[PDB]
Design a protein around this ligand. Structure first.
Ligand SMILES: O=C(Nc1ccc(Cl)nc1)c1ccc(F)cc1
Ligand SMILES: O=C(Nc1ccc(Cl)nc1)c1ccc(F)cc1
Ligand SMILES: O=C(Nc1ccc(Cl)nc1)c1ccc(F)cc1
Ligand SMILES: O=C(Nc1ccc(Cl)nc1)c1ccc(F)cc1
Lengths: 143, 349, 349, 143, 349, 349, 143, 143
């Protein structure tokens, strides 16, 4: 919509530090540092490659809007998401203890906090037993 | 109730779908029934056991188609257990699955026989036999290994095939006049073919001293050549299973999986579909168009997480070996160069 | 005497049990006797050598059962050579070994023949032949490799089997009318089966130009398919033997074995069953409920030694490879980070 | 027995430094340091896992009593013990020189002293020839 | 036009030359035509289908030779698409290619048949069949693996061959008098040969109890021995394909390729054939007989680049493994010795 | 002259001994002659070509024994080309070589025929055929791989063999009465044996519907089982050749070889047999019972060089891999601990 | 020619620092350092081995003239050159973007400048589309 | 002989630093250091194992005399010596350039000097062509 495009344009200028119609990796570094995170040149470059389709090295507003307008159902992440959960589903049943899901999710790599993972358990562990029916959740979200 | 009703539908769905060990045995028993029906038809072919035939085969066939439609309706009604199919339209598109499509078609034709025919009957039993593997992963596996070995396979067949022709030609000259067996060149074609294939019907064979002489030579060649592709594909399977077990030893993708899902749920929280969710919303506001900032930041980050996960999904045994191999060596290089730089910074003090 | 009496009992026990090279040859000779008895029975089947038969087979069979019970009593009386069986009750539970159980049962039945019968006789000789492998490790080894190769094996048989059916069907149509050989579909079933199996009785075979035409094609397919599983299992064995030799190259568990036994004897000394033992008691009192302190400390430590040993019992070739591989790289990482930290601590000076 | 349980309770409080009904890894570190040994967090944690059956991370008195009441015959360590001795039985006969058994036992990893290994030779090398009949010893002990 | 004319000539040249997937299929269809012509000749051998024969085979053969010369002229005229052949003389030397030479010779002989003959005809069809593989890489591949396995192959054949002779000898003694089958020693030669080859004509076979007795033993030996070389060559192919895929995994020669080409173009610029080119000339004059200095410097450097590239062209999997393996270890050694030297230089301060 | 005379003797000695490519071809031609003589004897067996036989075989045989003794005398007289044999006594002990011994014995017996006989003649030709491989390395290689695969080999034969017996038993019951083929149990023994061996004479085979039914099952089992050992030994050879080529890739023993020879020549110089040699004597006197000091020092050092060389003679692919693997990791450990120690020594400053 | 040989002799003395009729590795090191490059002993030794045919370790004038008088067509570098371009021809067609050819050529190992690689594109990318018809170029040069 | 045994006894006391009837590794270290060489504990221990047959860790005079009384022909080093020369005989003919034999022998590991290797060429390269007929030499010596 025009509202979404104009609002993405305002956020783009926020991210578009140099204002060249694209987002450069150095914009990305300084913006993430402003948010507190220290993104490496490889990370910001990977972000560009994710967003950049023309392959210019700087994220123009078209690529940003294309990325933003997509949804989890608009991601084709169903097989991917259930693959991940099955990797973290050691027994293969379709459930893993939400405790362990917190223990790895909130405690692996770009880990999250206890509150975010708790809401993850609420939205994921559909019956709320700790054993998240991860394929049901990935279906409800990725679809 | 209704909730547990749906959960049973979905569970039973993957029950009918890939089962781990238990329902696999169940479908096995299914195969037992169908295969037995085949064999009974086999005995049906002979008239000397006809009267002792129709009852079992007839009624059992009926039972078979019964359980056929049974599992079919379970499949179809449990089609909403996935995400796409639901209500009536999506699951309809599920019916658009050509497997399901032709399955139902043959299903009703089997119904049609309820009222040359037996010949089609046999063919039907074949087709239902093909039904055994749903996903047909067998065929994919084979074609995989074959195309992997295309060149050497073809060179094997081609070469030995030439050996066939030359052998047959010389033998034809050697015994065509002397032996009735070998009268036309096509004769020796047939003979040499079954010869090098180690079949050995024996209905024809050389009797000229000259023929047998040259033969034994060509035997020692041809038989080996034709047995080649068997052993080739065999060892190919054994290897590929070993390496598949090896990558089963090495996945390592838990890290990209976690970060993938993390950025994912970051999007889902940032996803304005649910603003009542605030744990990640509060996280983004506390970790600092501020809404689109948090959202778009997660979109870009989570997108790179998508690619980093997918790329990380396939780290291979010697692949990881050499990458960290070069890595560790080059790392050591950067480490030692930093060591030289650090000490030499101290040298100027 | 009595002590040396018992030690001989135990030694001879594992003599009857797994021998290294020497008694292995002895049991081999045992097998020689039994197998020969089999073959003699084989000639016993014919009446043209009957009179030249009964003496040897009869008396030799007697001798056989003699040595049977001989080794049996040696087994049973040497059952206390282990720990469990002793006196009369424990060794009785040893008799509860189903191998020993049915062995003795068939033993007495063999006695029963001392006073249709010959048919059971042959069957008996079979069963005693099964006796050859006591532990039956053969079967475990095979089933191991098979289940290891379950998928590809089944896909092999299934696929080529389908090739069988289709081949037979087309040939049936091609030559059923023309050739008496192929009159019922079951006929071509039998024929095509033995065809693709490279047996080639030759009693039936195509004579229609059309049949032979299509056949040769299907030959080139089917024969390869059926030979698949042979070569597959073969190479599987060769590999697995190589890797077994490799782990024979790599055990490394001496360290956990030592610490295991060390904590073990620590417990045994701390074990109040023997307080006159003081070397480890003096050790614990000098290495500082003090009794339960030394004991329980050893129990906890020795228990972790149990698990550390058992876990360490199975370090594998590429397993150890990648673990120390990642280890050495990550180690170097910690080492270099410590190097940077150390130099940079010097930087502020 | 009540005597064993009460005595294990007294020793447990000795080990139960914090007195939470369970033994925490830090209790284990400080207790072992008191005895002179420096147990790492992984070692004390492994000790908990050995003793801890409920999986709390701290050794309660139930797990301690279950571990303590077990004997070598109550360990099922026969195959394990003879496996170890066979690893240290290079020739496979069932004997190894008690000298070498000292050389590795008292000189491998968590090694022991000469006196402890000498008593090991006395109780193990049944005929006292230096060649310990290790399966006879493991049978007499592990049974 | 003329430029695009030439570019089409060159492109179509490698079209006729190694195509990737598309023209490969085209030449496949070519093979389809030729092979079919073969089979039709096969049916031509019989008089019972003669009248239904000549038209198709005759006209189709004509068509075949048509497309033969077609592709031939495309080959020859597209011979200048390389560097050597050009104008009329160089491409003439291209005609000196013995493949092209004998191809054209047989080509005109095929023309000669336009006006015993059929026997030569069949032979012709064979030869054209040999034409299938132009480069004949098949033969090179096979001979490669064979000579790789020369020793064990020969020991296999030789040993089992001896088994053949001994078997035949003993059987000859056993059944020569009793059975007509086996009358001369050459008889049993033929029989035992086809026996151990798993062919089993069955026209002759033992009937002496004594013969069959000894046979089965020798069977269990000989059959295995003769099947050896099949499985050997098979697994050999499977391995070598795996390792070839592995080196396909590891090339690494991009660095020497770049430096090679760099020094190359350095020469080309320094190459006085083109002095109007100045980018590398200006580079050499700005990076400082000055002309021969820049040229000869590039010649020496580019020559070392030639050897460094060529040597780098073949880095192998375990080759690179152990070289960097020793390298990294020895590197670490130099690194740590430098670390000791650096700290100890600081020690004297 | 005499010196060049001796050098020719020694060179020609290893000429008759292992040649590289050239004389290998020469002995090949030798084999050609002997083998041809065999085949001619083969035709000698038949009376229909007798008159066209004796001349060639007779004279050629004579020629053969001629070249036999020729190479023999070359062998014997070139026996001093080694170190042990010399003059008349040492080379006499060379004649004590049982290969040489029985060679000469059969040699003179071949002379004996110069003046039932033909049967021994054939046997002679066999034996001379065995002469082909002098060192017999073939047999060692085979037995190597076999004993390497003893267990799985035996389990293969044993298991399938049992399958044989059970199959034959059931078939015997099924068709003994109905079919004359199968009358005695030994009959079905013979039949099932050749059945599962894929030979398929076809003289006997089931005709009972019940028999054929059970058969096909047992076929699918037995045929695979018996083909096992072929493929097993085949892939075994292919592997072992690969690994042998791998160790051909990795020797590394040049360092211990050099130090070995160095300490060796140190001994030789210190060896008082030659005191006129002074380079190493001057070396020892200048590198400082002084004579026995230099000598005994070299003896102890050179002896450790002997063991270090011999031990270093067999560094294996994964052996060296893991040794330097653990080594490099533990090395890095010592290196980093030294790094910590060095920096922390600086910390107290 | 006599002109080429005498001119190569003058340049040889320029390279022949010690004047022993051959070029020693140390001459090579100092000469390359004079041009700015720092050639290692292994590099200069490899240069000798490339030029040195007699195997003396020092490049005499004969070896230098033999190397110099050779041309790219006198190199047999056709298969080699097209092998390299095919390695840097990922798709195998016979073309690669001249941009990427600059990116690797001018930016790999002993890399060149933008101007040299631009002239490379001009002489190589025959149609001047960026996709250098590398086999046509290697034929025109290596022949 | 009595002369050899008494002279070996005098040299043994020279090596037998501690005079315990055996030569200890520390005697070996100090003696080799006196000669200039620095033998590690592993090297001296290997020397003992070479000489020590009873396995005491110190070289008694019996082991020393047994080692000393042996000759190259008393070494069974023929296959070993020719194996070494064949490793250093790249072409397998039975000859290697005495230059290269100097280059590796005098320049590998415990390398020797030019004079010792020159005498090696004289005694080894029987025809004195540089190509040492190494099997003839190993036969003349090892026998
Ligand atoms: O299962 C059936 N057909 C089929 C065939 C192939 C595959 Cl792959 N799957 C399914 C079937 C069910 C009911 C019926 F009456 C007739 C046939
Ligand atoms: O050995 C005997 N049966 C047996 C069978 C299978 C296995 Cl695995 N072990 C033992 C046996 C001994 C004496 C006798 F009279 C009859 C039979
Ligand atoms: O292709 C032909 N011969 C040939 C044979 C072998 C190879 Cl390897 N290549 C080519 C051919 C073309 C025209 C014609 F009339 C007759 C024969
Ligand atoms: O070569 C001969 N026998 C032989 C056999 C086996 C081996 Cl392995 N080596 C040699 C031989 C030479 C002259 C002669 F008159 C008869 C026989």
């Amino acid at each position: 919509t025009e509202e979404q495009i104009a609002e993405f344009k305002e956020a783009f200028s926020l991210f578009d530090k140099d204002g060249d119609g694209t987002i450069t990796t150095k914009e990305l570094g300084t913006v993430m540092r402003s948010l507190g995170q220290n993104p490496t040149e490889a990370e910001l470059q990977d972000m560009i490659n994710e967003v950049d389709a023309d392959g210019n090295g700087t994220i123009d507003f078209p690529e940003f809007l294309t990325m933003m307008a997509r949804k989890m159902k608009d991601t084709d992440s169903e097989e991917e998401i259930r693959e991940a959960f099955r990797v973290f589903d050691k027994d293969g049943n379709g459930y893993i203890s939400a405790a362990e899901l917190r223990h790895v999710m909130t405690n692996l790599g770009e880990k999250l906090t206890d509150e975010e993972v708790d809401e993850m358990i609420r939205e994921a562990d559909i019956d709320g037993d700790g054993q998240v029916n991860y394929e049901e959740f990935v279906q409800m979200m990725t679809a | 109730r209704n909730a547990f009703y749906r959960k049973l539908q979905n569970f039973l769905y993957n029950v009918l779908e890939r089962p781990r060990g238990w329902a696999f045995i169940y479908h096995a028993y299914v195969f037992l029934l169908v295969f037995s029906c085949l064999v009974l038809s086999v005995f049906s072919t002979i008239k000397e056991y006809e009267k002792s035939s129709e009852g079992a085969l007839y009624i059992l066939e009926i039972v078979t188609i019964v359980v056929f439609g049974v599992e079919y309706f379970v499949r179809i009604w449990a089609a909403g257990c996935c995400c796409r199919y639901r209500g009536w339209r999506g699951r309809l598109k599920f019916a658009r699955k050509p497997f399901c499509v032709i399955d139902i078609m043959v299903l009703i034709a089997s119904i049609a026989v309820l009222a040359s025919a037996l010949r089609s009957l046999r063919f039907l039993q074949i087709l239902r036999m093909i039904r055994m593997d749903r996903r047909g992963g067998t065929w994919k596996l084979l074609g995989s290994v074959v195309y992997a070995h295309s060149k050497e396979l073809v060179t094997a067949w081609y070469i030995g095939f030439l050996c066939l022709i030359l052998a047959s030609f010389l033998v034809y000259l050697a015994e065509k006049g002397e032996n009735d067996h070998f009268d036309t060149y096509a004769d020796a074609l047939w003979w040499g073919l079954i010869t090098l294939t180690t079949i050995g019907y024996g209905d024809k064979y050389p009797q000229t001293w000259n023929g047998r002489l040259l033969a034994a030579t060509f035997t020692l060649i041809g038989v080996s050549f034709f047995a080649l592709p068997a052993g080739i594909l065999g060892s190919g399977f054994a290897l590929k299973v070993q390496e598949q077990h090896r990558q089963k030893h090495f996945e390592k993708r838990r890290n990209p999986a976690a970060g993938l899902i993390q950025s994912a749920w970051r999007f889902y929280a940032t996803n304005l579909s649910r603003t009542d969710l605030h744990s990640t919303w509060q996280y983004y506001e506390r970790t600092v168009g501020l809404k689109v900032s948090i959202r778009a930041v997660c979109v870009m980050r989570f997108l790179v997480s998508k690619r980093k996960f997918k790329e990380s999904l396939r780290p291979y045994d010697v692949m990881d070996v050499i990458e960290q191999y070069s890595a560790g060596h080059l790392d050591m290089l950067s480490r030692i160069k930093s060591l030289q730089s650090r000490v030499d910074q101290i040298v100027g003090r």
